[PDB]
């Protein structure tokens, strides 16, 4: 689960968007008459209408994540 | 679960957006008549209409996360 | 599960979009009359209408992730 | 499950899109009268209408992931 | 399951799209009256209307993934 | 299951598309009155209307994947 | 349009109802960007959840109605 | 359009109902970008969930109605 | 259009109903970009989930109706 | 168009119903980009899930109706 | 178009029904890009899931109706 | 078009029904790019899943109807 990263050293960008009536959902757990119910989220959940990422991680970066469900 | 990162050293950007009536949800746990109910969120939850990230992590950065559900 | 990355050293881009009435879902768990119910998300969940990624990871980067369901 | 990558060193791009009424789903688990029910997601889930990736991983990058279902 | 990659060193592109009423699904598990039900996703799930990837992995990159279902 | 790749060193492209009413499915598991039911996906699942990949893996890249169903 | 009625002269009843979440509409005129807009109602408009009429007009009764739209 | 009626002269009933989530509409005129728009209702509009009429008009009764649209 | 009726003179009933999620519409006129739009209703419009009529018009009754669309 | 009726003079009934998810429509006029649009209803429109009529018109009754579309 | 009727004078019944997911339509006029569009209904339109008529018109009754489309 | 009827004067019945997923249509007029479009209904339109008529017109009854399309 260990993560690592390193880095050493030694023009128009356009985005446009037009939208009418946009309905967005993410993670859902819909239920009825359930003796138990669990939701466990361990990661990135990006929801949106215009989810735009521009020129990210130009330098150095690292992400580590560990989730886990245990039931006995 | 250990994370690490390092860094050593030694033009128009445009985004536009137009939206009418946008409905956004994230993590949900909808239920009826449930003897137990748990929600456990351990990560980044970005919800929005225009979720725009520009030129992030130009230097160095690191994220670590660990969530965990245990039931006995 | 270990991840690693490294890096050493020693023009118009256009996107356009037009949309009317777009309905987007992600991970779902729909159910009725269920004695148990679990949702466990351990990864990146990107939902949207215009999910645009431009010029990411120009430098160095790394992601590691480990999720796991255990039931006894 | 170990991943690794490295790198050493020593013009118009156009995308356009027009859409009317687009309905997008991701991972789903639909059910009725089920004594148990589990959803376990461990990877990238990109859902959208215009999911556009431009000029990503110009430098160096690495992703590792391990999910696992165990039931006894 | 180990992956690795390396790299060392020492013009118009057009895409257009027009669509009316496009309905897209991903992974689904539809069922009725089922004593158990499991969904386990360990890989990349890209769903969309215009899923366009342009000029990716110009540098170096690597992906590793391992999912696994065990039931006893 | 081990993968590896390496690389060392020492004009119009057009795509157009027009579509009306396109319905796309991916992996599905439809069932009724089933005592057990499992879905296990370990690979890339690209579903769409215009799934266009242009000039990918110009540098170096590698993908490894291993999924596995075990039932006793 | 003339109406008339006359009359001369010379045991359990049960209704039960149970309802959850009932949404009822009547006459509607929904519009956008309309140079003129008219609604003209001349009759009985009974809207409800349990609209119950029991043992009405046991004697004598009469109803007359005349509505009319004129535009020149 | 003239109506008339006359009359001269000289045991359990049960109804039951059970409902969950019932959505009822009546007369509607939905529109967009319309230079003119008219709604003209001249009659009985009974909308409901349990619209029950029991033992009506045991004696004598009469209804007359006349509506009319004129446009020049 | 003239109506008339006359009359001279000289045991369990059961109905049951059970319903889940019933969606009922009546007269509708759905449109887009229409230079003119008219709705003209002159009669009885009974919409419902359980529309039950029991033992009506045991005596005497009469209904007359006349609607008319004129456009020049 | 004239109607008339007359009358002179000188045991269990059971109905049961069970329904899940019933969607009912009546008269509809769906359209797009239409220079004119008219709806004219002159009669009885009974829509429902359980539309039950029991022992009606035991005595005497009469209905007359006349609608008419004129366009010049 | 004239109607008339007359009358002079001088045991279990069972119906049962069970239904799951029933979708019912009536009169429809679906269209696109139409310079004119008319709907004219002059008669009885009974739509439903269980449309049951029991022991109607035991006495005397009469119905007359006349609709007519004229276009010049 | 004239109708008339007269009448003078001087045991279990069972129906059962079981149905799953029944889709019923009536009169339809589906079209695209049509310079004119007319629907004219003058008669009884009974649509349903269980359309059951039991012991109707035990006494006397009469129906008359006349519709007509004229275009010049």
Curated annotation (Swiss-Prot), chains A, B, C, D, E, F, G, H, I, J, K, L:
Sites bearing Phosphoserine, chain numbering:
62
Swapping residue 25 to A leads to an effect described as: Impairs copper-binding
Location(s) in or outside the cell: Cytoplasm; Membrane; Nucleus; Synapse
Binding of Cu cation, residues: 25
Q: Where are the transmembrane segments?
A: none
Give any Gene Ontology cellular component. Answer: cytoplasm
* Positions annotated as sequence repeat: 17-31, 32-42
Tissues of expression: Highly expressed in presynaptic terminals in the central nervous system. Expressed principally in brain.
- The reply to whether tRNA processing figures as a keyword in the UniProt entry is no
What does the entry's free-text domain comment contain? Answer: The 'non A-beta component of Alzheimer disease amyloid plaque' domain (NAC domain) is involved in fibrils formation. The middle hydrophobic region forms the core of the filaments. The C-terminus may regulate aggregation and determine the diameter of the filaments.
The protein's assembly and partners? Soluble monomer. Homotetramer. A dynamic intracellular population of tetramers and monomers coexists normally and the tetramer plays an essential role in maintaining homeostasis. Interacts with UCHL1. Interacts with phospholipase D and histones. Interacts (via N-terminus) with synphilin-1/SNCAIP; this interaction promotes formation of SNCA inclusions in the cytoplasm. Interacts with CALM1. Interacts with STXBP1; this interaction controls SNCA self-replicating aggregation. Interacts with SNARE components VAMP2 and SNAP25; these interactions allows SNARE complex assembly and integrity.
Q: Which family does it belong to?
A: Belongs to the synuclein family.
**Entry function:** Neuronal protein that plays several roles in synaptic activity such as regulation of synaptic vesicle trafficking and subsequent neurotransmitter release. Participates as a monomer in synaptic vesicle exocytosis by enhancing vesicle priming, fusion and dilation of exocytotic fusion pores. Mechanistically, acts by increasing local Ca(2+) release from microdomains which is essential for the enhancement of ATP-induced exocytosis.
- Could you identify this protein by its name? Alpha-synuclein
**What organism does the UniProt record list as the source?**
Homo sapiens
């Amino acid at each position: 689960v260990v993560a690592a990263a390193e880095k050493t050293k030694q023009g128009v960008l356009y985005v446009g968007s037009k939208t009418k009536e946009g309905v967005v959902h993410g993670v859902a757990t819909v239920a009825e008459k359930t003796k138990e119910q669990v939701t466990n989220v361990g990661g990135a959940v990006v929801t949106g209408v215009t989810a735009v990422a521009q020129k990210t991680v130009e330098g150095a970066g690292s992400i580590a994540a560990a989730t886990g469900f245990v039931k006995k």
